[PDB]
């Protein structure tokens, strides 16, 4: 469960990300595809090379979903309901992969938020991404 401090930390950090959310989303995906090649099995129709327009576009979508989750941090199961349906029933991404994207998102944030990424904020962001991941895999079976 996200604590009051967690939610304060997540909102502050994502607020600092600001207009860069889409950029950071694309970067996190690139980091994931390079660091964890098995995740590429879910994107065989994508151009996954550096500078990919498809990755850039997807990055925006992922970022937008996270921004919405932050806006509805006390009701994420319902805010992310359609997205959870999509992953559970159509895309059918194995649940183990959500930790991989979450880690790459953390690394991206760490690389861009020197002052903001304190150990406490680090902890809160990790919990937040784990919670988003839990919601996105909640309808798999």
């Amino acid at each position: 469960v996200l604590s009051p401090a967690d939610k304060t930390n997540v909102k502050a950090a994502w607020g600092k990300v600001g207009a860069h959310a889409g950029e950071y989303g694309a970067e996190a995906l690139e980091r994931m595809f390079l660091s964890f090649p098995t995740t590429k099995t879910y994107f065989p129709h994508f151009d996954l090379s550096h500078g990919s327009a498809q990755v850039k576009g997807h990055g925006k979508k992922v970022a937008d979903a996270l921004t919405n989750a932050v806006a509805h941090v006390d009701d994420m199961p319902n805010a992310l309901s359609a997205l959870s349906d999509l992953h559970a029933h159509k895309l059918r991404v194995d649940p183990v992969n959500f930790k991989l994207l979450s880690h790459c998102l953390l690394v991206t944030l760490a690389a861009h938020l020197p002052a903001e990424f304190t150990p406490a904020v680090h902890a809160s962001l990790d919990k937040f991404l784990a919670s988003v991941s839990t919601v996105l895999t909640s309808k798999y079976r």
């Binding site: 879910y42 059918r92 798999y140």
Partner: protein
């Protein structure tokens, strides 16, 4: 992994009693029922709507037999699983786009199917040896991913 002479003996001894056809079909079928997202690779197999439809599906059974047959051949290469499964590793990565986590899920289901069939004969030490094998085969099949 690395099996001891005693574990290698236990693995081979039990495998000599395995109906690969039945166990292969059961294992793939239960994979698709217990972890239904794994059905994503088998749209062309037809009806997978219910557990009974999955378990009785001719293509599921065919394809379970083929998979466990290759598994069986691998048991003759226990000290070089990576070498023997190198070709199939590349195939599953580049041609089939199969997340290697699926290999681990199938391994765990296979252990359940063996326990279900053999009962008390599937002792904790025998299970432990087979856990080493299914882990080794999963790791071997994932090894050439890129």
């Amino acid at each position: 992994v690395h099996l001891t002479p005693e574990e290698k003996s236990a693995v081979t001894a039990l495998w000599g009693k395995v109906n690969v056809d039945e166990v292969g079909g059961e294992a793939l079928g239960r994979l698709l029922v217990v972890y239904p997202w794994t059905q994503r690779f088998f749209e062309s197999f037809g009806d997978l709507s219910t557990p009974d439809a999955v378990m009785g599906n001719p293509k599921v059974k065919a394809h379970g037999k083929k998979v466990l047959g290759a598994f069986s051949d691998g048991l003759a290469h226990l000290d070089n699983l990576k070498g023997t499964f190198a070709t199939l590793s590349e195939l599953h990565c580049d041609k089939l786009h199969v997340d290697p986590e699926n290999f681990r899920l199938l391994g765990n289901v296979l252990v359940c199917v063996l326990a279900h069939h053999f009962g008390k004969e599937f002792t904790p030490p025998v299970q432990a040896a087979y856990q080493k094998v299914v882990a080794g085969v999963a790791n071997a099949l994932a090894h050439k991913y890129h």
